[PDB]
């Protein structure tokens, strides 16, 4: 059977409300005298009428703003009786996909991760890993993450002694000059913008590390 071709509609829509979309309509109103409705979650079910269709005619309607992250696609079903109350067509289905919109800031797990690093290592030497989270779309920019450290302290010897993975967020240094009896730890901050690290659309966030030097 040929497939009701699906509503892509976007999360936090501004309305007004009802918005206008589709008007699925069956072809005996041709001598019949046909009456609509729906089914399944956001119309006859929770969130119970979300989705509204015009008893006549067949306009089919949402009521409100949506949200991806709390049901992604609908899985709706028209129906047609006539006035005599009848049942002339098969309940069609009709699938609403929510899309993404980047209405999420990353977290970060633990806002507080902590680790070591022996005493002088060599350079590019791995001291920790620290990850983010985020709730929008992951194949999206939407929820493609990059992490970078924002701050480091103490800012001796170099004030730059470590590093991290741009994209799997692992600190590394890139400076020698680490001594246990000189700076015991080093707390640094560590954002996580996302938007694929884009800085003028994606949401920062942040949580810091504490690396403490190994004897
Ligand atoms: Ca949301
Ligand atoms: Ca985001
Ligand atoms: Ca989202």
Redesign the pocket.
Known sequence: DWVIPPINLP?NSRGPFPQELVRIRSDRDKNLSLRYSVTGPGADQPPTGIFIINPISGQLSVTKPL???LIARFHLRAHAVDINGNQVENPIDIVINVI?????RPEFLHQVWNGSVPEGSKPGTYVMTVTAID???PNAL??MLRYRILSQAPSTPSPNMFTINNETGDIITVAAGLDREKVQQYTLIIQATDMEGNPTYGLSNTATAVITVTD
């Not at 993404?100 to 999420?104: G, T």
């Open positions: 999360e949200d991806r992250e993404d919109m980047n209405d999420n709730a929008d779309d939407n929820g």
